[PDB]
């Protein structure tokens, strides 16, 4: 169950989804939780006094923001998502994200096109590291592109 956080109804839905999930092993993902720093503190206290199902997982999506409470950060395990360190890492991430059956369809030339796209996507993204020379501006070339 995926929930955006900003709405007042989102807070009510998040609590019900979490309460249902902790008794069934269901997964809950809450996105943009950095937009509600005050509610995040109350969620950390709620999670502390809880013994959910062994399969239950709670995912919190946020930007890297100083508003995120320290107490929540200590209670959870942090994973940083950022541009891949280089061309090799960028292209390996691309080939893992795209299912194999996607590339391996009937036209055999489809595989080389995806490689060219992966190389092109890596070169364009890596040039952003050179803020001014690679591109005049810091464009958000990303996964959607």
């Amino acid at each position: 169950t995926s929930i955006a956080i900003g709405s007042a109804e989102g807070f009510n839905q998040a609590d019900k989804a979490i309460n249902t999930a902790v008794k069934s092993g269901r997964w809950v993902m809450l996105k943009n939780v950095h937009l509600a720093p005050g509610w995040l503190m109350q969620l950390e206290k709620k999670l502390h006094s809880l013994q959910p199902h062994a399969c239950f997982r709670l995912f919190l999506t946020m930007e890297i923001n100083p508003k995120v409470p320290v107490n929540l950060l200590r209670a959870g395990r942090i994973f940083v998502f950022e541009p891949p360190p280089g061309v090799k890492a960028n292209m390996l991430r691309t080939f893992s994200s795209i299912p194999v059956s996607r590339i391996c369809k009937s036209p055999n030339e489809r595989a080389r096109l995806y490689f060219l796209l992966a190389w092109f996507h890596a070169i364009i993204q890596e040039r952003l590291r050179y803020a001014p020379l690679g591109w005049s501006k810091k464009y958000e070339f990303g996964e959607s592109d």
Binding site: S2, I3, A4, G6, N32, T61, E140
Partner: protein
């Protein structure tokens, strides 16, 4: 006897005029002829009012006044009757035609039945006696309608959930407001009333065509008159209910257009791939079909020709028939170009313009295809083009047309678009089409982004109109929340309409994240349509919106347009951004847009004109100076280009009009040959660009014009007709009119320029410094147009920043989701509804106030070509053509390009309004308007002749004004603040002469004495009006400058400034010192709050305050805290009876609502025939609002103080808007006085120049050393009469007081600590403190006097000090000063360092030994432990001093304490212990995690009742931690200063308070029954009994910030720095 005839005519009209009755469905007899009734009543009301001016009105005064009452009563009744009858009609239809509502809402249905019974009963009475007078005499008919209106409104607001149910049955109702929907549902039989609502539910359907019966819908029509006739008409009889035949109309609109398209495609194919086109046949085909289908047919034919040509080129080397496709386009475009070179019908001409724009693009695409040697239909350069495939063999007519771009395929929606202006199809627009259609195929949203004026919104609509979709534009703001967006999505999804959300990043970031969930679920539903496995004969696709299953039409789409460069905007979360495909639209192709538009309008030299106009705009943006009101973007270019076509059409009409009276040589083809096309373009540029230019840019732009358009001259039309009316209106308004270089000529040009902008723009700004003539320019123009054109002009003036943005536009209820209109929304909706003929009048909505992006960007869709006010409830209000949106502002330093580019600009400079013009206006009014309410006018006229020489250009006043601007003033100096002050003072001088004539009925003042008085008073008035806000040195310097240049006789003293002289009524200079006697003050009034010792400054300031106050002119006293501003104002008010002062204490958090509570308590709102009037409750009294800190209220990030804008509105407009009912309220007998510290002081903001022009400022400085000696030497002489043996020491005691006070004021300043302010207030407390310690004493040695003097100095100067060094300095210099002025005294007995005074060991306040005091406090602490608080305390020396300091404050009236120190130092415990020793009850608010503002208000009521009604002495001890909200201190700031909170007791609380006050005052023996008298006694009890102790920790940032939030904490509370334990 002409007056008698008018009365006879009025009597005869109303003895026969009957309410015109019509049967309504055999139920009652409604009333028509509202226009006839209202105009007839207004006509007699004006005639009765006008005949009062006639001198013969006295004989018929009573009869005319009787008719004024009757006519006013007729207006008040039928203005309510019309709204009651209107509401009953559609409510009766709903509660009769839908039996389901009776079960759904039984309570409302029965309640409506009861009201519907009383309405029908009153209808039957009207039927018996339809005569208006008989209806007017029906008992309680006025109150019956008032109850009917209120009751019917409650039923209306109770049908909201029923309306939400009907919106599902016809989803286009989701875009209609609740009231309009009730009109639609309830009037389902009266179809003629449905016509005004179709523009809200349809893209281009403005009305429907009906048969004579109104039972069959024959077709639909657009706002321009274009009609679509249905192939199969829709019968309303066979489908009676509103939502089914409306659905059938929507379907027949789509089916008819598709059938009409097939017929059009058949004919247009003949024109395609044809060598020659006959214009008559082609024009016939254009006229036969609708504008949207004509362009659609042309696109279909061109696409199939290219497909045919590319198919033949399959071999590659085969000959190219693409040239024939180009050839056909060339031939067709030549016929279109020839057609627009001559006169055409307006609908056909626009159709021809659309075809030219379409074919120019087809010509460009075909040329690109030929140049690129494309020979295959599957080539991407052809697939990337937008193509149109038509299959006549397709069975479903709605799917015969397929629009394909790249891989994206679309069906045509066949929404009737009417005649929508098309965009020039530029390469940027081509790229926009490709990107957005890729997003549509991917079931993603489109996100065009870029700076303002790049075509983002128009391109989205153009693409939607290309696909035949209903495109809805929403001007988003922060009020578009999750619930509002979802409901809009529900309407969009079911209708199948496109949502273009502009300024989408103006939503809050939390709302953007929440909305992303709704956008995603719709997009998943959209992909279910695209699934080939899904079959149309199955369950409809549905997504979950707002916890409901909502059907999704495949045609709906979501688009967001944003300016990512605007600072302060919300950043979109990434999960939302992945749902949209973004395209940068940054550089519009201006030269192509200009070339195609000029070519489509018929300009033969369009290529030459486009190559000049587009670079010219580029040059203007760089060659001209930089101004915030300058725009040379695409909107400005588009405005000129559109105006160019309008100017070309009028010249052609003018040329042939000359030909009608000169021969019969109409040769239209040759008429276009000799047509100055360049001169036409220059006229459009000058009519649109010139009014925005500053003076030094005007020659620059004409040099640029000569550079790009050589030999082309601009000549304005000499508008004699308008200028004659303007000249007459100026005469009636005492204004100066000029022509050319005459006086007032520049201003008249700006009025004419403003008129030109009103004819080209529906939104315009008048920008210029305060006092530039902007207001008079549009007020005079509005009246002149009424006389010239016969159309009544109505102006609604709004101060947008004087109210909250919620009160300007409205609010959506968080829970009930009910919409309440704001001020602007209510005004615009009233004009659209046109209940009282507002659509036939010129309606100007003037936003007079500051412009900031927060509120004006809600008008982006209003000010652009959309002309729509979009509300978060989904409602869209169209701007009627008779409405102009105007913005009168002094600057645009916070407006963004988005706003500036969307509005016509007229720039006013301060040179436009010359000082000679202002002088003429003052003299003209002085010679015509009597000041008394003629012997008074005769005095003014003679005085005007005397003043006239000095008010000429380069006269005394002009030279004085120029010199004054060179001086330094406590506030910023503006021309109108000086002249406004100067004219008020001169009016008082005229009143002085009249008052003298009253004193001398025998010998009135002669001209020689009148001349002798006026000249000196004018000099006197000039000095105070131009330097009264400056220091003495600046006041002096203006004196010598006047002395050099004036010829008025002046005082001949060698070194006495002129400002030191008044003007006696005998026309002689008299020194102000003659009115400053050395008084002896009664010994019991020593340093009392009401006692003022006359000084040179006090008598001058009081006289100046008297003049401004007597004229009801708002004024501000400015000076350092404690300089005597309140003292001087209240002293002047004592000499001015019939004026009640009410003190308001502004803080940083003060809003207009503080003023409104004061109005609620002291004033009443009364309904008058001319509107609501707010007047003081007490009759015959002028109520003075005294604001003590008028420049503390918080300035927002856009430089605006809301309360200041509110006060400016009440002064300049004489009123304000009541936000509850959106009604203008007029003030009567209410004036304003301000007090403040200099704006350079911390926490103080400069006052707006638009507020200062009305408010003269007097500077009250601290009294000098000699003035202080005179003031407190008088007090010391009186107080030392208690002990006759101490009379000799009066002078040294005063000298020591002044010396130490001056030294302390220099030593400690606000730079070190924010509370280091020393003023004569300390001197007043110093004398009072000594006096209180001397009253019960029969005798005292001089050493005893010094000890009291030293003790009070420590309490007043040392107790606030923070540092030990500062306290050491104060302790040392007290000894130094005392021995300097008191030699031969025993130092030890008088200055022993432990100086302690107490009344605990005796009856009197006498010195106490430290050890004796320690034993007493231990003895009392023992009792305190057993009775109040068993917390043992260790007694050290500082505690003994502290408890004595707290004891002093609890024994003073309004004794408030500010205890500052570290937590746990005993501040609260000592306060409770001293409170228990003085008999004071301790009150502490019992805060908790859920303690809120209304909990604090109830707690405040409890304490005030006990101390105000029960005479209970209370120590209200409250800590800084108790302040859980800033609103807590706004209440305490008022309570500390005034002992009252104006809005704390309301409703039943006030009624209970009055009962308790009456009981409380009875126990005191006072005879009080009046509520006002009871409230004053209650305030006086709170003043003497309530003691507030404020405890806070030392925080440097917190303490400085604390002063602005609660200035009363630092000037009404005694501060004791307990600090930390030493």
């Amino acid at each position: 006897m002409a007056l008698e005839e008018f009365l006879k005519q009025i009597r005869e009209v109303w003895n026969t005029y009957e309410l015109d009755l019509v049967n309504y469905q055999n139920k009652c007899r409604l009333i028509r002829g509202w226009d006839d009734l209202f105009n007839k009543v207004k006509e007699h009301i004006n005639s009765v009012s006008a005949m009062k001016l006639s001198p013969y009105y006295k004989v018929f005064e009573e009869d005319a006044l009787s008719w004024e009452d009757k006519l006013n009563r007729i207006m008040a009744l039928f203005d309510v009757w019309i709204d009651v009858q209107r509401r009953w009609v559609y409510l009766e239809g709903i509660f009769t035609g839908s039996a389901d509502i009776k079960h759904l809402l039984p309570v409302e249905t029965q309640r409506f039945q009861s009201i519907s019974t009383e309405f029908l009963a009153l209808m039957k009475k009207v039927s018996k006696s339809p005569l208006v007078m008989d209806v007017l005499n029906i008992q309680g008919v006025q109150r019956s309608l008032e109850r009917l209106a209120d009751l019917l409104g409650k039923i209306q607001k109770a049908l909201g959930e029923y309306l939400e149910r009907e919106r599902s049955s016809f989803p286009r109702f989701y875009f209609v407001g609740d009231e309009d929907l009730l009109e639609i549902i309830g009037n389902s039989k009266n179809v003629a009333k449905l016509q005004k609502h179709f523009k809200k539910m349809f893209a281009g359907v403005s009305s429907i065509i009906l048969n004579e019966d109104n039972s069959v819908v024959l077709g639909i029509s657009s706002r321009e008159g274009e009609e679509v006739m249905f192939k199969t008409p829709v019968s309303i009889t066979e489908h009676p209910k509103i939502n089914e035949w409306l659905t059938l109309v929507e379907k027949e609109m789509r089916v008819t257009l598709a059938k009409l398209l097939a017929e059009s495609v058949t004919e247009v194919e003949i024109f395609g791939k044809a060598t020659s086109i006959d214009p008559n046949t082609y024009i016939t085909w254009i006229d036969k079909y609708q504008a949207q289908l004509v362009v659609l047919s042309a696109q279909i034919a061109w696409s199939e020709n290219v497909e045919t040509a590319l198919s033949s080129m399959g071999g590659g080397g085969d000959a190219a028939p693409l040239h024939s496709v180009l050839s056909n386009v060339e031939v067709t475009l030549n016929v279109l170009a020839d057609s627009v070179l001559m006169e055409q019908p307006p609908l056909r001409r626009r159709k021809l313009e659309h075809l030219i724009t379409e074919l120019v693009h087809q010509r460009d695409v075909t040329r690109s295809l030929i140049k690129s040697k494309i020979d295959n239909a599957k080539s991407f350069e052809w697939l990337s083009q937008m193509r149109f495939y038509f299959d006549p063999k397709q069975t479903d007519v709605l799917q015969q047309l397929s629009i394909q771009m790249a891989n994206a395929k679309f069906n045509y929606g066949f929404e009737y678009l009417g005649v929508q202006d098309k965009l020039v199809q530029t390469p940027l627009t081509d790229r926009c089409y490709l990107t957005m259609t890729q997003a549509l195929e991917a079931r993603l949203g489109g996100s065009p982004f870029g700076p303002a004026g790049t075509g983002k919104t128009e391109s989205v609509k153009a693409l939607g109109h290309q696909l035949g979709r209903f495109v809805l534009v929403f001007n988003c703001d922060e009020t578009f929340d999750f619930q509002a967006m979802g409901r809009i999505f529900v309407g969009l999804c079911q209708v199948g309409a496109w949502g273009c959300f502009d300024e989408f990043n103006r939503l809050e970031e939390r709302m953007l994240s929440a909305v992303s969930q709704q956008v995603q679920c719709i997009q998943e539903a959209l992909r279910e349509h695209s699934n080939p496995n899904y079959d149309k004969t199955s369950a409809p696709i549905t997504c979950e919106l707002l916890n409901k299953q909502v059907k999704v039409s495949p045609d709906m789409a979501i688009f967001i347009t944003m300016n990512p460069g605007y600072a302060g905007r919300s950043n979109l979360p990434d999960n939302l951004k992945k749902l949209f495909r973004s395209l940068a639209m940054t550089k519009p192709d201006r030269q192509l847009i200009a070339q195609v538009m000029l070519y489509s309008q018929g300009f033969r030299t369009a290529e030459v004109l486009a190559n000049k106009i587009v670079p010219f705009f580029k040059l203007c943006d760089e060659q001209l100076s930089s101004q915030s009101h300058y725009d040379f973007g695409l909107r400005a270019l588009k405005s000129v280009l559109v105006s160019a076509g309008n100017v070309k059409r009028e010249r052609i009409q003018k040329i042939k009009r000359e030909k009608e009276e000169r021969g019969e040589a109409v040769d239209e083809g040759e008429i276009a040959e000799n047509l100055p096309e360049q001169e036409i373009l220059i006229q459009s540029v000058c009519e649109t660009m010139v009014p925005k230019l500053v003076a030094e840019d005007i020659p620059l732009l004409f040099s640029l014009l000569s550079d790009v358009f050589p030999g082309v001259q601009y000549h304005r039309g000499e508008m004699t007709a308008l200028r004659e009316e303007l000249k007459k209106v100026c005469q009636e308004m005492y204004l100066t009119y000029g022509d050319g270089e005459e006086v007032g000529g520049m201003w008249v040009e700006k009025v004419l320029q403003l008129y030109q902008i009103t004819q080209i723009n529906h939104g315009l700004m008048m920008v210029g410094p305060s006092g530039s003539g902007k207001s008079m320019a549009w007020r005079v123009l509005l009246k002149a147009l009424e006389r010239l054109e016969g159309v009544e002009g109505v102006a609604h003036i709004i101060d947008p920043k004087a109210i909250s943005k919620d009160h300007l536009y409205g609010t959506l209820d968080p829970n009930t989701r009910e919409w309440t209109d704001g001020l602007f929304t209510h005004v615009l909706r009233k004009i659209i509804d046109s209940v009282r003929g507002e659509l036939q009048k010129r309606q100007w909505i003037v936003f007079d106030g500051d412009v900031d992006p927060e509120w004006v960007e809600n008008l982006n869709s209003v000010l652009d070509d959309n002309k729509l006010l979009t509300l978060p409830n989904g409602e869209r209000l169209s701007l009627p053509p008779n409405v102009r949106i105007m913005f009168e502002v002094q600057d645009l330093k916070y407006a963004t390009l988005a706003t500036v580019s969307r509005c016509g600009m007229v720039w006013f400079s301060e040179d436009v309004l010359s000082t000679d013009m202002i002088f003429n206006n003052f003299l003209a009014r002085l010679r015509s308007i009597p000041l008394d309410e003629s012997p008074m006018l005769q005095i003014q006229r003679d005085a005007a002749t005397i003043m006239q020489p000095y008010f000429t250009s380069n006269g005394l006043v002009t030279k004085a004004l120029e010199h004054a601007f060179q001086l330094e003033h406590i506030m910023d100096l503006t021309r109108l603040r000086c002249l406004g002050s100067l004219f008020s003072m001169l009016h008082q001088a005229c009143r002085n002469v009249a008052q003298y004539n009253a004193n001398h009925p025998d010998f009135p003042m002669q001209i020689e004495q009148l001349e002798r008085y006026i000249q000196r008073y004018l000099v006197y008035a000039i000095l105070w009006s131009l330097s009264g806000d400056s220091r003495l040195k600046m006041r002096a310097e203006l004196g010598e400058y006047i002395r050099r240049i004036t010829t008025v006789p002046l005082p001949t003293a060698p070194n006495i400034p002129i400002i030191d002289y008044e003007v006696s009524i005998s026309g002689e200079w008299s020194p102000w010192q003659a009115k400053v006697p050395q008084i002896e003050v009664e010994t019991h009034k020593v340093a009392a709050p009401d006692v003022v010792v006359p000084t040179l400054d006090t008598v001058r300031h009081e006289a100046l305050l008297y003049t401004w106050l007597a004229e009801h002119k708002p004024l501000v006293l400015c000076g350092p805290p404690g300089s005597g501003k309140t003292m001087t104002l209240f002293s002047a008010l004592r000499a001015l009876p019939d004026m009640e002062v009410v003190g308001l204490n502004f803080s940083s958090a003060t809003t207009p609502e503080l003023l409104l509570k004061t109005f609620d308590h002291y004033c009443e709102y009364r309904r008058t025939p001319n509107g609501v009037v707010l007047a003081p409750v007490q009759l015959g009294k002028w109520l003075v609002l005294f604001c003590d800190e008028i420049n503390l209220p918080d300035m927002d990030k856009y430089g605006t103080q809301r309360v200041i804008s509110f006060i400016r509105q009440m002064v300049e407009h004489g009123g304000f808007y009541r936000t509850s009912d959106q009604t203008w309220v007029k003030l009567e007998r209410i004036q304003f006085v301000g007090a403040c510290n200099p704006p350079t002081d911390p926490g103080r903001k400069p006052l707006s120049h638009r507020f200062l022009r009305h408010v003269p400022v007097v500077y009250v400085d601290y009294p000098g050393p000699a003035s202080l000696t005179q003031i407190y030497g008088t007090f010391n002489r009186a107080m030392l009469r208690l002990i006759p043996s101490l009379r000799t020491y009066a002078e040294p005691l005063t000298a020591a007081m002044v010396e130490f006070y001056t030294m302390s004021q220099e030593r400690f300043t606000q730079d070190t600590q924010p509370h280091y302010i020393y003023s004569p207030r300390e001197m007043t407390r110093w004398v009072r403190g000594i006096f209180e310690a001397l009253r019960p004493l029969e005798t005292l040695p001089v050493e005893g006097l010094i000890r009291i003097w030293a003790h009070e100095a420590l309490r007043l100067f040392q107790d606030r000090l923070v540092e030990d060094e500062e306290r050491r300095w104060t302790d040392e210099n007290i000894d130094t000063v005392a021995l300097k002025h008191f030699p031969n005294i025993d130092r030890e007995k008088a200055m022993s360092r432990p100086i302690l005074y107490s009344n605990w060991l005796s009856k009197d306040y006498i010195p106490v030994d430290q050890e004796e005091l320690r034993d007493y406090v231990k003895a009392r602490l023992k009792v305190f432990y057993e009775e109040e608080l068993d917390v043992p305390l260790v007694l050290f020396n500082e505690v003994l001093d502290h408890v004595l300091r707290i004891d002093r404050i609890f024994r003073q009236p309004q004794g408030h304490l500010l205890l500052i120190g570290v937590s746990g130092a005993g501040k609260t415990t000592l306060s409770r212990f001293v409170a228990w020793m003085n008999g004071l009850s301790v009150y502490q608010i019992k805060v908790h995690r859920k303690y809120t503002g209304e909990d604090f208000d109830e707690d405040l009521r409890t304490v005030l009742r006990r101390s105000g009604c029960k005479n209970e002495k209370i120590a209200f001890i409250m800590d800084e931690s108790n302040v859980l909200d800033s609103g807590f201190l706004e209440r305490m700031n008022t309570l500390l200063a005034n002992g009252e909170v104006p809005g704390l007791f309301e409703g039943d609380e006030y009624a209970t308070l009055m009962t308790q006050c009456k009981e409380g005052a009875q126990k005191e023996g006072l005879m009080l029954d009046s509520h006002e008298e009871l409230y004053k006694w209650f305030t006086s009890q709170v003043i003497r009994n309530l003691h507030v102790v404020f405890t806070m920790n030392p925080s440097s940032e917190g303490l400085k910030d604390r002063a602005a939030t609660s200035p009363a904490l630092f000037n009404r509370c005694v501060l004791n720095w307990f600090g930390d334990w030493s």
